[PDB]
Scaffold this active site. Structure first.
Site: not given
Ligand SMILES: Nc1ncnc2c1ncn2[C@@H]1O[C@H](COP(=O)(O)OP(=O)(O)OP(=O)(O)O)[C@@H](O)[C@H]1O
Ligand SMILES: Nc1ncnc2c1ncn2[C@@H]1O[C@H](COP(=O)(O)OP(=O)(O)OP(=O)(O)O)[C@@H](O)[C@H]1O
Lengths: 326, 326
Positions: B192, B111, B195
């Site tokens: 980690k 938000k 993509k």
């Protein structure tokens, strides 16, 4: 012809006010415009419901609509949940409406000053209502002054989708009832007549039995001047009655005034009581027939069937645009 | 056999880490459980998408899941929007979840300190993902550490609905991945493998051509010690490499170390570049076959179709309890 979409909340009880106010005009208009009367049972689910009751009010209302004179050959009358394209267009649309729009929706005051225990459906029903309308390319939506604001949004969304993905939706227009015939309460001549009034005597239901109708009109509030003359302020009660009486009997107010020239309210009420009873009788009959007849279901089936046809195509084109599926 | 639901966000790119981490073990699992691999495109529309890109990434993901070895006969592979029950049950769940519950969702922070220009999609997708799951009486939802929070809510919704309308839903359980390894970035061994990384050199895509796989493993970070030995801390880069290497070649770490005993990184990387190229070659082949084969659609068809058979009977029972329709 142009299309008209009307969402009916399933409540199994419409007042002589809805009837005079809008219902009536449709029995006629239904031959000129393309009309869809959707028993929005998915919207009625945002608040508590008793399964049986809801299941029942959906029949009662369809039954009623047909009784009043809606022609299932002439128009489409379906239950909302039986056309899945509704819930699908709801989601696709939920995706292009910004959260602000929903919160700044002048109705979300149901937040209860920090209740926070409201069903998300309550904040999200607008996208669904937008779906309902846009799916059938409806040109006109007969809404009251209280609704307008919602029709504003769907106008917006539509225009937003249309610009992002291409002309697909018709931007609707919120049309109102034929003006003058605003039916006030029987017990409070300033207040509008509504199913939601806590006093049963403020409204007459299309299914009110003779006795009830008689008793309620008798109680109708009047003034002490004792003359049957139209006066918006000063003589509200008498003027409300005069409107009811007129619209139903087909006589002009002047006509009714002169006709009661030397009489008082006692007889007036008694005459009005009858013209009301005489106007509902065929309706309560037809209604009862419709309710027990297996033909109802069939009409609802061919209704969904007719709706779905259009919806499916609209959804299909939306997915194409959005880029979903294959 | 237990049921397993797995929603695949269409993105047309899955990394060697995702393959190792989860995907690869699915081809195994797919025989001990009842698997549903749903390409969740309705969720993917909560954020801007290019229609053509989205239509494409949906085929890509399906071509790839089969390429990697998912058996359309053993497991079910379907697009989310081709099964209307999802969108329908989504609305019914939205009607039983409190606004608070949605807002307190540890992810809605999107938000953006007062952004408000966020699709209602961002706030309401949970009820949909709850449906995605619940609709298939699933037992295990293989999620990540981060996703757990969502399973909690849907578990809740499940129960609430079961207590209010009756035992119908199966409370799901969020299982965690196999792995016992985790694949790091090629450019930063502490991060980690993923993509969503802004530096392409950080990961290898199952569809990366050999020249690229070469150029990316070259760049992979190593230390300066010059020895091929495992050391989580101290030698992060080398350990990651050694991890990628082992899993794909079936060779233990102890073995690989001993194997490269007096060699340096120069050769090692070159060797690794090969074991990967070799491992993915068949995959890129099969994938391409599926992409130009019409058998792809037939598989998605019978997929949707297999799913819809279960979803519909779920929505039927759902509407039944809620009191909707007839
Ligand atoms: N008392 C009334 N006078 C004039 N028009 C009315 C009156 N009550 C309802 N209507 C009209 O009938 C149609 C609405 O019905 P609904 O039955 O949805 O109305 P409400 O007044 O919104 O609800 P309720 O009748 O349950 O209190 C609307 O388009 C509205 O303009
Ligand atoms: N580097 C990794 N190591 C181990 N498992 C991974 C890795 N990347 C992805 N996965 C597996 O793939 C599933 C996750 O998600 P996703 O496909 O969401 O990951 P990404 O490939 O990291 O994408 P993104 O971060 O943009 O969401 C996980 O539940 C996990 O089992």
């Amino acid at each position: 012809m142009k299309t008209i979409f009307s969402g009916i909340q399933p409540s199994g009880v419409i007042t002589i006010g809805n009837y005079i106010g809008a219902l009536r005009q449709f029995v006629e208009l239904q031959h000129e415009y393309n009309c869809y009367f959707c028993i929005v049972d998915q919207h009625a689910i945002t608040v508590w419901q008793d399964p049986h009751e809801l299941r029942q009010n959906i029949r009662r209302l369809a039954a009623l609509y047909l009784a009043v004179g809606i022609d299932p050959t002439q128009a489409t009358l379906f239950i909302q949940s039986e056309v899945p394209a509704h819930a699908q267009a709801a989601w696709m649309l939920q995706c292009i409406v910004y959260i602000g729009e929903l919160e700044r929706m002048t109705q979300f005051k149901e937040k209860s000053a920090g209740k926070e225990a409201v069903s998300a459906g309550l904040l999200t029903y607008p996208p669904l209502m937008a779906a309902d309308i846009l799916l059938y390319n409806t040109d006109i939506v007969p809404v009251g002054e209280d609704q307008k604001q919602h029709i504003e949004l769907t106008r917006d969304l539509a225009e937003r989708f249309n610009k992002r993905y291409g002309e697909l939706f018709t931007i609707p227009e919120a049309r109102i009832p034929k003006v003058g015939a605003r039916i006030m309460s029987l017990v409070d001549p300033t207040k509008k007549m509504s199913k939601s009034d806590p006093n049963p005597k403020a409204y007459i239901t299309l299914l009110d039995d003779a006795k009830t109708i008689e008793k309620k009109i008798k109680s109708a509030v009047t003034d002490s001047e004792g003359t049957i003359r139209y006066d918006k302020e000063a003589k509200p009660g008498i003027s409300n009655l005069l409107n009811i009486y007129s619209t139903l009997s087909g006589q002009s107010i002047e006509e009714l005034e002169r006709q009661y020239e030397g009489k008082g309210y006692g007889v007036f009420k008694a005459d009005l009581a009858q013209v009301v009873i005489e106007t509902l009788r065929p309706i309560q009959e037809r209604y009862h027939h419709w309710m027990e007849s297996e033909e109802l279901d069939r009409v609802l089936d061919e209704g969904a069937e007719k709706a779905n046809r259009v919806a499916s195509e609209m959804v299909r084109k939306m997915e194409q645009a959005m880029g979903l599926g294959r």
